[PDB]
Design a protein around this ligand. Structure first.
Ligand SMILES: CN(Cc1cnc2nc(N)nc(N)c2n1)c1ccc(C(=O)N[C@@H](CCC(=O)NCCCCCCCCCNC(=O)CC[C@H](NC(=O)c2ccc(N(C)Cc3cnc4nc(N)nc(N)c4n3)cc2)C(=O)O)C(=O)O)cc1
Ligand SMILES: [Cl-]
Length: 159
């Protein structure tokens, strides 16, 4: 089973290359808890933004270009990425936008953090249809001394 996990600004704007304009360690904690001990599939921009292998996860980077870090696994196609994950209960696809578009048709679950941040940009999380998905968890948090913006964790399961 393949899941996508993403942090979305208003109107589902997501990162394209430069770091997103927020400071959300609680979102990073949610990401770490929902991805640890699972293989993670990412594109090259997300890899650069992470800046290091994510510990405790097989890191798989989908890129047309040769790999530049032997600490992680480099693949050139979607099927190669899935194969590198091997036989596990859940694959976490962690972005960026082209990777989400590639994997959404295969995915059964979305972990979304909806962030109340007005971020300008043309890159968006792919369209999902409101009703093709069951929202099974939702939990709101206000901005605080450590987190710049309010944020709502949601888990959806494909109908
Ligand atoms: C891009 N992505 C992709 C991404 C992101 N989010 C997503 N979210 C979702 N939902 N989904 C996705 N797919 C998704 N993808 C991802 C995905 C995952 C991850 C990922 O890491 N994750 C880890 C978990 C976290 C972790 O483990 N993260 C990090 C791990 C390392 C932590 C160990 C600490 C080592 C020390 C290093 N320390 C430092 O550098 C700071 C230096 C230090 N200072 C401070 O500390 C400090 C602080 C506050 C301060 N202030 C307030 C007051 C202040 C401020 N600024 C000032 N500036 C000026 N001039 N003047 C001031 N007076 C001033 N005052 C002042 C000073 C020091 O002075 O010594 C993990 O998944 O294991 C990352 C990216
Ligand atoms: Cl990417």
């Amino acid at each position: 089973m393949i899941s996508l996990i993403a942090a979305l600004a208003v109107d589902r704007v997501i990162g394209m290359e430069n770091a997103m304009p927020w400071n959300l360690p609680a979102d990073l904690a949610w990401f770490k808890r929902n991805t640890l001990d699972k293989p993670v599939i990412m594109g090259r921009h997300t890899w650069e933004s992470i800046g290091r292998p994510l510990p405790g996860r097989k890191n798989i980077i989908l890129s047309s270009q040769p790999g530049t870090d032997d600490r992680v696994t480099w693949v050139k196609s979607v099927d190669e990425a899935i194969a590198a994950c091997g036989d596990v209960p859940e694959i976490m696809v962690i972005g960026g936008g082209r990777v989400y578009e590639q994997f959404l048709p295969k995915a059964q679950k979305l972990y979304l953090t909806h962030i109340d941040a007005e971020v300008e940009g043309d890159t968006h999380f792919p369209d999902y249809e409101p009703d093709d998905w069951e929202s099974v968890f939702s939990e709101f948090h206000d901005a605080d001394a450590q987190n710049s913006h309010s944020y709502c964790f949601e888990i959806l399961e494909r109908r």
